[PDB]
Design a protein around this ligand. Structure first.
Ligand SMILES: Cc1ccncc1CC(=O)Nc1cccc(Cl)c1
Ligand SMILES: Cc1ccncc1CC(=O)Nc1cccc(Cl)c1
Lengths: 304, 304
């Protein structure tokens, strides 16, 4: 028992981190097979970051201008190209530690582990969620760019995120591994609006089932609700509207605990309307939305 | 910016995890050099767990009765011995992936990363703290025994914890890597009292400095306090008494923010006396005590 904001073991991703330098700028790179992926702003200087013309800037760069270092050994760059907001540096050596992997574009609400890096070296790993507004509430400093978000299914690493920037609001923005930004964000040092962030209702419900599994049952009530009635409450509290798709994915947790999805929604409704009253659920004084129903099942059953 | 419950990258510890079987019991083992460390209850059956006579049970076990498996390959056991509550299985092969390492016995209040394992395979990594009462609030299921807690200083892994049992209360108990339990706990399936748990005051103060560094400053007040006055409040709220030693370790954070340690104590005093009033600090609705002053400095400066 016990429930934690658990990240995936980062070993497979650690063996992929490299340092990429270009001019005065240094950031992290992702070495899979004979290719190094990194944010395209590695080619920019501080004057450029206001409104960089990446196509013009990259034209002044040759393969030799990109310094790729794995540990303390140098990688020979034999090719370079831009794909959306990432650079793919073709190197003459395949990464001997390249795990089985996929490039995946996640949906908002889904979660992933971030391996935060500086100068190609790992500093820490944490679990986070793609917010409904396509930002992440990470922990990143200057030089963290190029750090990646991932998921792991037995031996396959699905890379889903690459960190690019911190918005003036303190939240983080980045791309999938094809360099397409999540959300409306552009890689420019400019004021950018993130959407209104909503709470991931299906994840809060999954976390309430995780609380029941682990003994925290005070919030269970004698009530039930409908999807429509629940969503009237969710709308008011800026919670994502619950669909039959969300109810279906909560099916295994509902079966495990014997608590119907709509009865759990009724508990969530009372929690939203009356607060926690100074109490806690799984060591938290607020409703947690960063565990998907999949994360709950995985953690409570010990999937390796 | 941003602050997360970050764990150490687990790669160096992943390469050390093995599966250890003895009779019907299987748990995790830690392979460093030519030695495999695991909990001594691997030699027990369900009847034994009530009051096991480990010295008598181990006498019925030969090197061949201990099945050690790293990935899918078997390790030949050439020796076995008991040290307190751990078994040290001498194997004929040194772990090729053994990192630089130390065995350390942590103090309560200190933090560490846990790499939770099942059948020798890693399932996840999370950051946790040794509670003042010597228990950990982990996330562990049956088969997680043998999973280790560690810290990393550049390239050296300091192993500080080995998971042994879950108390009937749902909290977790274990040993250092010499097999000495933290706290009064014994490796028996019996009702055991954990101490009254207190909040780690120096860690809450470190986390309030982390909030200030990252923009959350609403809790800063026009007040100051004394160590004695503060401790009268800490006593009432079951917070650890603050000493000049704790004040000294908060020195770097005090210097970084320009907020005197005692002024921060006064903010904590008002927070304890008046609650959060529905507000949050670093995405939390309660006072977080699982980040040491060292963890705050490391995270806010990007130590790799
Ligand atoms: C300072 C920091 C903190 C966290 N994560 C990243 C950073 C650096 C950063 O924001 N870079 C940046 C800024 C605007 C545009 C672009 Cl392309 C990149
Ligand atoms: C079921 C579980 C959940 C979390 N962590 C561990 C476990 C197994 C467990 O508690 N083992 C145990 C019990 C009493 C004594 C001793 Cl020696 C070992």
């Amino acid at each position: 028992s016990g429930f934690r904001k658990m990240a995936f073991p980062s070993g497979k991703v650690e063996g992929c981190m490299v340092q990429v330098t270009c001019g005065t700028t240094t950031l992290n790179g992702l070495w899979l097979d004979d290719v190094v992926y990194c944010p395209r702003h590695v080619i920019c200087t501080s004057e450029d970051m206001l409104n960089p013309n990446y196509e013009d800037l990259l034209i002044r760069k040759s393969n030799h201008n990109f310094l790729v270092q794995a540990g303390n050994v140098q990688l020979r760059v034999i090719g370079h190209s831009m794909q959306n907001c990432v650079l793919k540096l073709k190197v003459d050596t395949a990464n001997p530690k390249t795990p089985k992997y996929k490039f995946v574009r996640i949906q908002p609400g889904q979660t992933f582990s971030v391996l935060a890096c500086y100068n190609g070296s790992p500093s820490g790993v944490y679990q986070c969620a793609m917010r409904p507004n396509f930002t992440i509430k990470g922990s990143f400093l200057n030089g963290s760019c190029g750090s990646v978000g991932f998921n792991i299914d037995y031996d396959c690493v699905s890379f889903c995120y690459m960190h690019h920037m911190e918005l003036p609001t303190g939240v983080h923005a980045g791309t999938d591994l094809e360099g397409n930004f999540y959300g409306p964000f552009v890689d420019r040092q400019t004021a950018q609006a993130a959407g209104t962030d909503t709470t991931i209702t299906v994840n809060v419900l999954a976390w309430l089932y995780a609380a029941v599994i682990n003994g925290d049952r005070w919030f269970l009530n004698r009530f039930t609700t409908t999807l429509n009635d629940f969503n009237l409450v969710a709308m008011k509290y800026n919670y994502e509207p619950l669909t039959q798709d969300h109810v279906d994915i909560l099916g295994p947790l509902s079966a495990q605990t014997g608590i119907a999805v709509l009865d759990m929604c009724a508990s969530l409704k009372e929690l939203l309307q009356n607060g926690m009253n100074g109490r806690t659920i799984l060591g938290s004084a607020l409703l947690e939305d960063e565990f998907t129903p999949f994360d709950v099942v995985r953690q409570c059953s010990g999937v390796t």
